[PDB]
Ligand binder design. Structure first.
Ligand code: ALF
Ligand SMILES: [Mg+2]
Length: 873
């Protein structure tokens, strides 16, 4: 009992592996008990130290074929009625008195209690029972960004449309508007000042805080650009108005109060649209939590002659060492060993396939599995976080948190732009000061400011500052923000129209970078439902008659292969109605015997035996060499096969297997032609995976891959610097989908897989994945083009604003500033909208492009990898 040791085990891929390890270790003398988990690869062994040593245990585990290495409970409760300190003190004293409890404290302010103890000796149930006996009850314990950007945009609009309208009205012709309340100001100037001040105070607040955050990050983005430009323009306008007032100037100076409202308007709109597009809801965690069983039926004493009472207890409160009865159709509450129970379990959560798995005494079960075929009793071994489903939840959380935001190309452009605009503005200022100082005739000729009585130096300085600030205002791109959001929304709409649901804007901008794609085998590449592939005849009755007789015999069978056979027979036959007279008898996993005396019904449209080789061997029916070879070939192909005999005579054989999707081969070929790697990762048997890869022409095959191993492969491929797209439709694929750079979920897949994936194929056609790439390409290029439209119109303005074309007679006009934004925004919006004309490439185009290049692959060329370390053949 004492000196229990901890071990780390690697190379283990099956629950049967865990059962074998536990059985072998317990068989050896000295070892008292052994515990191990599947995905965690952690084990705990209790043994007598004086008989065996941890090194011997590690050597024994290694001999089993799994690498072994030697390496080195808190409960929170709320208790009602904790209104007195005496009760808390008494509870604490009673807790310390009981053995196995290390510490226990209770807070009177919030009635919360924390207890630290050894799980092997004490559990939450004991503490709860003690508290109840004492006399008290105890029980165990982005939109903001959108809202703020929307508020900024709305304020900027409300207080910027009026000023823009006033500017347009002035541009069209207005005498009263130029009238001066005081010698310096004018009505228009005062209204502009008030409106710009209101917009800056209200609309720009979030701009200012975001810019401050960006500077704290040692980076300059669009927010910093807008804040700098608008603040400079507003400060200069206020300063010139103030000096005009002080000097009682006859004419009010030109002001740039127009610019800040305009830029705030459009940039806030762009940011708001970007945040709307980026928003997504991930509920995979909620679905996984829903998978786990809510409660368990704890059984006191044992399953042996003494069975005193049963209780219903929350799975959270369940502790190791308690026998729990799971009824048919009920979820397995905790991982454990089956005792005195035999049934079937669905392990699609881990292994991923729908084939039921037998459970017998000495076997192991996984939490969250669906039981059937009868009741079972389970002795718990892992509970709570230690459960496999909890480990999958942890992996999904880690994958989701690992993902980092992708920097917007707008921010990257602004990072260069801000120094560029600063440099050009300073250059314009200094060169104009120099020109004014050296000659001063150019200033007289090209500006009326010389008419002012101020000194020449003041004239040149004011002209240089005005020109520099005009250049600064013109340089700012108003449509920069909208370029990416508009294209992202249009691409998402196009994808939705074409049958692809894209959550967020990241997949559209990332799919083009994909160079490696991993495909799940079941569902994703092949239809999940098993289907009959080939029927052979082993005195010479028609095949259809035998098929009808089997379907009548197999009508009541609940085996998935049974329903597959029955549906195949019904499809082959008229299947107007099944025979009324039929007697059925089934032995679990052995064979089925039926009596059918309604062959007349089949003819209008006397015994049946369905079994495997073992059934024939025990019944005494010999197996011919040719049929044996055929069955061996079918087993090599990985497809299941069963035999039908009538009146004790072998009659026929039926084979059932999954059917590869029609477009799987074409999709794989297209991906390979485009230069993208294709990998088949699955949890099924190696033979079936190899056969499916041969059919779909995938060179790299991974078999018996646990959910954690899929994430490990994703991480390795990403560490190779490649971008990975994971296509899955099961729970085991959800952590890989979350971790993968791109996650594609088949429309018919599980809810968790759909939630985790960023792209969902509503049409459940594999070729859409290729389209999901092509469309993404058509998007990204467009975005780049939009950015050109966002800058070119403003950029061409900069030479004019700086006076480059002034001697030619071209000078900046007030209408040019507004025209630049109008043209840029219109061009960006129209370019983004043009993506709606995108047409999905036809499947016929794919087939023609691969009409001759496509070729079947030999089975030998394909290499199958079993597990992460590939220890097994
Ligand atoms: F359907 Al799988 F791994 F084979 F998710
Ligand atoms: Mg699947």
């Amino acid at each position: 009992a004492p000196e229990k040791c901890f071990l780390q085990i690697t190379g283990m891929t099956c629950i049967s592996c865990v059962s074998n390890i536990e059985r072998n270790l317990k068989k050896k003398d000295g070892i008292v008990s052994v515990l191990v988990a599947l995905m965690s690869g952690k084990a705990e062994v209790k043994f007598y130290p004086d008989r065996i040593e941890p090194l011997e245990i590690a050597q024994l585990v290694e001999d089993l074929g799994f690498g072994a290495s030697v390496m080195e409970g808190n409960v929170e409760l709320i208790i009602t009625g904790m209104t007195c300190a005496s009760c808390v003190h008494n509870i604490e004293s009673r807790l310390m008195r009981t053995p196995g409890i290390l510490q226990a404290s209770v807070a009177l302010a919030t009635c919360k209690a924390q207890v630290k103890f050894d799980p092997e000796i004490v559990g939450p149930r004991d503490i709860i029972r003690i508290i109840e006996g004492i006399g008290f009850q105890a029980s165990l314990a982005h939109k903001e960004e959108i809202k703020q950007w929307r508020n900024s945009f709305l304020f900027s609009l409300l207080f910027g449309i009026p000023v823009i309208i006033l500017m347009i009205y002035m541009l069209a012709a207005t005498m009263v508007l130029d009238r001066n309340i005081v010698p310096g100001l004018s009505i228009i100037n005062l209204v502009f000042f008030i409106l710009c001040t209101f917009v800056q105070t209200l609309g720009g607040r979030y701009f200012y805080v975001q810019a401050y955050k960006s500077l704290k990050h040692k980076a300059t983005n669009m927010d910093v650009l807008i804040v700098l430009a608008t603040t400079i323009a507003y400060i200069y306008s206020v300063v010139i108005l103030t000096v005009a007032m002080v000097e009682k100037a006859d004419k009010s100076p030109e002001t740039f109060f127009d610019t800040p409202p305009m830029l705030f308007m459009f940039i806030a709109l762009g940011r708001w649209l970007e945040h709307i597009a980026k928003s997504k809801t991930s509920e995979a965690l909620a679905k996984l939590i829903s998978l786990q069983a809510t409660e368990a039926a704890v059984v006191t004493f044992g399953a042996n002659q003494i069975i005193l009472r049963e209780e219903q207890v929350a799975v959270e409160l369940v502790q190791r060492g308690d026998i729990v009865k799971v009824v048919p159709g009920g979820k397995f509450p905790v991982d454990g060993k089956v005792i005195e129970g035999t049934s079937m379990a669905d392990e699609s959560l881990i292994t991923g396939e729908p084939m039921p798995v037998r459970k017998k005494p000495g076997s192991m079960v996984i939490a969250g599995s669906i039981n059937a075929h009868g009741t079972v009793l389970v002795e718990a071994t892992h509970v709570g976080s230690e459960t496999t489903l909890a480990q999958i939840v942890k992996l999904v959380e880690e994958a989701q948190m690992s993902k980092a935001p992708i920097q917007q190309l707008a921010d990257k452009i602004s990072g260069y732009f801000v120094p560029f605009i600063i440099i050009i503005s300073v250059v314009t200022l200094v060169t104009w000061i120099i020109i004014g100082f050296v000659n001063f005739d150019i200033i007289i000729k090209y500006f009326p400011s010389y008419s002012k009585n101020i000194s020449k130096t003041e004239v040149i300085i004011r002209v240089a500052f005005q020109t520099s600030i005009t250049v600064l205002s013109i340089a700012c791109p108003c449509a920069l923000g909208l370029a990416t959001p508009t294209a992202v929304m249009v691409g998402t709409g196009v994808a939705a129209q074409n049958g692809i649901l894209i959550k967020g804007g990241e997949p559209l901008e990332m799919a083009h970078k994909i160079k490696a794609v991993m495909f799940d085998k079941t569902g994703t590449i092949t239809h999940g439902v098993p289907k009959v592939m080939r029927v052979l005849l082993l005195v010479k009755m028609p095949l259809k008659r035998m098929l009808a007789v089997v379907g009548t015999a197999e009508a009541s069978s609940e085996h998935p292969l049974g329903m597959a056979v029955t549906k195949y027979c019904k499809e082959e036959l008229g299947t107007e109605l099944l025979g009324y007279c039929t007697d059925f008898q089934a032995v679990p996993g052995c064979g089925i015997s039926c009596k059918v005396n309604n062959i007349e019904s089949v003819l209008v449209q006397h015994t049946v035996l369905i079994g495997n080789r073992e059934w024939m061997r025990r019944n005494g029916l010999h197996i011919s060499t040719d049929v044996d070879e055929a069955m061996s070939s079918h087993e090599m192909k990985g497809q299941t096969a069963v035999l039908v005999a009538i009146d004790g005579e072998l009659c026929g054989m039926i084979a059932i297997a999954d059917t590869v999707k029609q477009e799987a081969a074409l999709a794989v070929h297209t991906l390979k032609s485009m230069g993208i790697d294709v990998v088949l990762i699955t949890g099924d048997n190696r033979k079936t995976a190899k056969a499916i890869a041969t059919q779909v022409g995938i060179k790299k095959v991974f078999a018996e891959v646990l959910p954690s191993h899929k994430v490990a492969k994703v991480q390795a491929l990403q560490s190779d610097n490649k971008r990975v797209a994971m296509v899955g439709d099961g729970v085991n694929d959800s952590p890989a989908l979350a971790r993968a750079d791109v996650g594609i979920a088949i429309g018919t897949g599980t809810d968790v897989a759909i939630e985790a994936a960023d792209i969902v194929l509503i049409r459940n056609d594999l070729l859409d994945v290729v389209a999901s790439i092509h469309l993404s390409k058509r998007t990204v290029r467009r975005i780049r083009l939009n950015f050109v439209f966002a800058l070119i119109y403003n950029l061409l303005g900069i030479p004019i604003a700086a006076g480059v074309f002034m001697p030619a007679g071209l000078v900046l006009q007030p209408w040019m500033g507004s025209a630049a934004m109008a043209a840029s925004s219109v061009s960006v919006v129209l370019s983004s909208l043009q993506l709606k004309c995108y047409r999905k490439p036809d499947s016929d185009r794919y087939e023609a492009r691969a009409q001759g290049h496509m070729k079947p692959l030999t089975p030998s060329q394909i290499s199958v990898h079993i597990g992460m370390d590939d220890r097994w053949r």
